[PDB]
Amino acid sequence: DVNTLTRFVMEEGRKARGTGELTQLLNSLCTAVKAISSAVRKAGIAHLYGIAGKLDVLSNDLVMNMLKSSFATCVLVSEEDKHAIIVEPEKRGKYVVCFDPLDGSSNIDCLVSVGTIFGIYRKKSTDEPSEKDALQPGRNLVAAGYALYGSATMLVLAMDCGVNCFMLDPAIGEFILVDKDVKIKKKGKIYSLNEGYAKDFDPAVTEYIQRKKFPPDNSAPYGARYVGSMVADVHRTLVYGGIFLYPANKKSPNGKLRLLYECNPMAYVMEKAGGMATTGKEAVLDVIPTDIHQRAPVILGSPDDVLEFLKVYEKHS
Amino acid sequence: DVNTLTRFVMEEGRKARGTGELTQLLNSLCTAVKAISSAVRKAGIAHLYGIAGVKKLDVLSNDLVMNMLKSSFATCVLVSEEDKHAIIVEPEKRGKYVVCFDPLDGSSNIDCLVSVGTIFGIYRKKSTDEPSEKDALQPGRNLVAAGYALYGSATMLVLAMDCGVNCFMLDPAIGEFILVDKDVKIKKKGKIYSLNEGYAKDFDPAVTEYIQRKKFPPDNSAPYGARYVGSMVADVHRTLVYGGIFLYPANKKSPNGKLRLLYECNPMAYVMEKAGGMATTGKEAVLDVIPTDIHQRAPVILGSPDDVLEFLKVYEKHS
Amino acid sequence: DVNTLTRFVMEEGRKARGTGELTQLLNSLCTAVKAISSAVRKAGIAHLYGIAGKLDVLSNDLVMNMLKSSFATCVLVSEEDKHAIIVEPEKRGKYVVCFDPLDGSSNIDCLVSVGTIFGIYRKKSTDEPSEKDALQPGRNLVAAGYALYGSATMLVLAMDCGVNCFMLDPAIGEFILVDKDVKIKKKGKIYSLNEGYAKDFDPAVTEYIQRKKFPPDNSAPYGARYVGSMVADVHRTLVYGGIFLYPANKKSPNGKLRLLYECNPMAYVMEKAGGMATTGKEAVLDVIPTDIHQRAPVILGSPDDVLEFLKVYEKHS
Amino acid sequence: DVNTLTRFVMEEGRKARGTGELTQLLNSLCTAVKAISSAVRKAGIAHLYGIAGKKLDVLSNDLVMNMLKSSFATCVLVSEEDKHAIIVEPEKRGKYVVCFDPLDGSSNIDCLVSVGTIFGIYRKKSTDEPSEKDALQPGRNLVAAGYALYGSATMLVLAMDCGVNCFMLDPAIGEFILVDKDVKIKKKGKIYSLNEGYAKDFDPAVTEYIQRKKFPPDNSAPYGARYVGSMVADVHRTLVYGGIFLYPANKKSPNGKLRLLYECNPMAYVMEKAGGMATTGKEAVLDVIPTDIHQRAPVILGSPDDVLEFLKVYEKHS
């Protein structure tokens, strides 16, 4: 039987006897995602070029405005905004959302895949909402996932019930459930990182990559793929298995990717799908943040691959 | 003044006072590309999943391109990645052009929603013989027009002709390709290199050395960034827009490369050269290779001219 | 604040503290409506005409399948089906839906406006579900309305809270709330019926229409509009006021339109908008049906107009 | 074999060995129609209602005006929306004159009634500097005419010397697909279409003609009645199903109500190319010689047997 994102979430929500607030939040976010997809695919671009005589900004505005008007949120953290946005009292609900509204858009000029990343926390205190309510470890996530605007648009949603993938059908503007309760391959054959920084790699990363090209057990060398857009590389990792790395380098000693709205949501999806996500020293989801924009190293993907990296890492202490 | 692909092509065609056959071919191709784009973006996928109670995209894309080109009355020989032999257009529909195309390049990994694309190269039939597979065995130098549609974050058609390279964005709201970048030229030198480094164990020594220079520059310059989507159209388009170098080179296990000369390497080589870039096998310009088999493979290193020249110096150093 | 059909319904649902089942039904119906709209606008018709080398049945299948899979329905009555459809046990919910999946489609060759009409009842007995569960007077309606596939696609939804109109934005597949709590004009200036059959008119219809064209006082004659598609004519009546008639005559003593999925839903929309809908003898919503396909006369619209018709009607009684 | 509007027109153009200018005009017009369709169907209306925190008839006029200007195929443009003829600037001037109604019927678009775009295309006949007078040609001089109907689906009906062809807009690919070729209207229909609200003002010929449709003297079946009130919708039904459409003069409209240049003439041309008829009562619509670009005309059009029967009634009343 066919299923849609809205109906699936309503069915899980009624099952759990929740109040509906998370459903209202996720439905609003889905509306924003469909609007981002439409603009990213350049619907209406003829009007900008004069037929009748910004994208990261628009995407941020869509997510902010839909989440605010959902009555489900109180604190909103975005890659685009220096400080947390505090929802005004009349529109406040109980959830905190950290999101990247158009990840990868710095290279959208070459039509690279881009995406929207989000993580949802429940506000724990009766204190007035503030930026500090977003300073939770990824372990506290109630839901996370991403929309990938690739060759097609897909929303990947991870909750306690598992990871589910929904294809946007542009003919009807509906997210169709196409992959249920997805689990990542135990071990893959693709590794994904920017080898342009080889001169800056930690010795553990250098050794691990060497194992991928010259395997010690005489297995076949891994293929390499690096789109340079996190959502595209991570989604490929989920679908085909393998490993994605953005480790520390000379320009980024704490990594480059952002803990709150890049690393934690992807770590949560990976773990809910039976994969792993590590900084090298600990699970991404266990890092306790002190800055809503702080960076974190991330190595994620199939469990055997991440475990193999951790073995190399531990060898170098 | 706003411009669309159709209007751009009709105006160039009236300027050149051609008969309209190439315009008819290109318009038919654009219609196929719009239909491929619609399917790649999964319009109607709800019906496959039972909303009311089927082909793979690469098969459907081949059918779309084949049928629109046959019915254009502009073509006589059609070479597709999908078909072992050239398709000969039936007599009542024959025009003067030969088209080699890859209808959905990169589709092997479309399960992960990677960018995919359509690549095409257009020749004029040279012989007065009955049309045959031999009419497709022309060097890339003979191309009349070539380019690609990239189904990425948006859909773009890049079209190269004698007048240069022009980029048209598909507006899905109205099904028109809007001219957005005119007479584009590639950067003289870039800062990105693009190849599958997972197979480093098999690299030719010149490739190994060149990549080492990009990561560990001898002149204290900044190391290049690396990008490899693994879908030729996505990687080549990034090379065009940002500059830099793309490599799918020969090695000991693959002395002729992996990519296909007629409908992958030649069209991209032609786009690159019309944009002021370069495209080499290592031994010669891709566009100068004279094919003997419509599916033969060719190595390709292409992109910003300084980057390709630097690669060629390393290649020559290793003989 | 922007509002969508889904958000509007969930909000009314949490206000009313319902279980969510009616929201699940309405979300499912909206998905079917978007899919009908897409097919009605001929998305994909190029494939039927050979680019790569029924509509009423499809519309019925979309509504049937989306409602069955909603888990909110137990008995489904459609203009397209001779008998009531009984939902299989594992998918049964508490609601009964009567619908016309593509009203007006008999003339769709000329691209006339078409529409989907629906009325939703609560199943009243604990008996095994059967056709009798749909034999409720329109007074028992929980929700009713229609989708108009006209120059744009609009969903008009009537419930206890009133009548609200939602415009389908095809770029994102969301029904946008554009007219809230709408009320019909007290008196209009348009009459709508097929005057070609004047020779069969009941004498009261003949006189009433004659008064619209040749007013006895010095008022302006009414304009005439008759699309011949019920959803188009009723929606114009709602928007501009006036009167719509498909009355009884000697050859058709029960009228021609169908009570369960044409007359009752429109009568309910009209009454919730402050309009009226009569058979001539009684309110449409008070007719107790004995046949799921039974016909009913209907005269509906602005109350002053319907009351004036009833004055002429009794005069010939 | 599948066929599209662009491909059909290029093929007819190469057959006739024209210069391509009319094709350039028609392709530009079709681009405008697709953009009007997108806006009429309310794509993007969520942004207008604040999802991120022109009137349709004005936008439609701007789309057609701008695409026709930039086509280099036109010199004088007459629109329902513009008091005076628009003169194309010298560097963009081509040889054709276009009269159009960019969004016919939009006064009631509040009720989502079908709306449409109507157009008629002339060759500029005079060598004078382009002016409003270049649009004052009788409909007989039309080179091409037709309409887009934004109804349950979007359809473009194009009439030329080769006949009338109907193209369905496939929104999935933004392409007009040829679905009805060389269309001909039924010799006689069973539907009449007019606003009977003006019955008190009808001239005796119309009153009698309508009486014949309801109470046939030969005891045949009465005609059904349909009146959307949007000309493109009513005329297209007449083309597809046959029958007759009337908008005669009345007291509010003593010279008729519909506009000669960009409503009556294009529809009259489509009807005649489809084997139908279009009369003012006194003469063929296409034979009226206009003096004012916004002048009105009575019109009775449709199946030839139906219009001929009307004209017989008209003659009887002198």
Ligand SMILES: O=C(Nc1ncc(Br)s1)NS(=O)(=O)c1ccc(-c2ccon2)s1
């Ligand atoms: O939505 C509701 N209740 C409702 N009542 C009526 C309607 Br209709 S939906 N509750 S909820 O908290 O928002 C929620 C949504 C999803 C949840 C989930 C997913 C996996 O595990 N739990 S929990």
Ligand SMILES: O=C(Nc1ncc(Br)s1)NS(=O)(=O)c1ccc(-c2ccon2)s1
């Ligand atoms: O299209 C025509 N003639 C026409 N007549 C009327 C119309 Br309308 S189009 N000829 S052509 O050969 O097909 C051609 C198309 C594009 C060309 C080109 C691009 C760059 O440099 N030359 S040449």
Ligand SMILES: O=C(Nc1ncc(Br)s1)NS(=O)(=O)c1ccc(-c2ccon2)s1
């Ligand atoms: O939807 C719910 N409950 C929910 N809880 C959480 C979420 Br999220 S939805 N209940 S309901 O019965 O389906 C219903 C829907 C609309 C209703 C209505 C409209 C006007 O007057 N009443 S009543």
Ligand SMILES: O=C(Nc1ncc(Br)s1)NS(=O)(=O)c1ccc(-c2ccon2)s1
């Ligand atoms: O388009 C051309 N020539 C071309 N050459 C190459 C290309 Br490609 S198009 N000429 S034309 O005048 O514009 C014209 C268009 C349609 C016409 C017609 C329809 C019915 O009867 N005549 S005549």
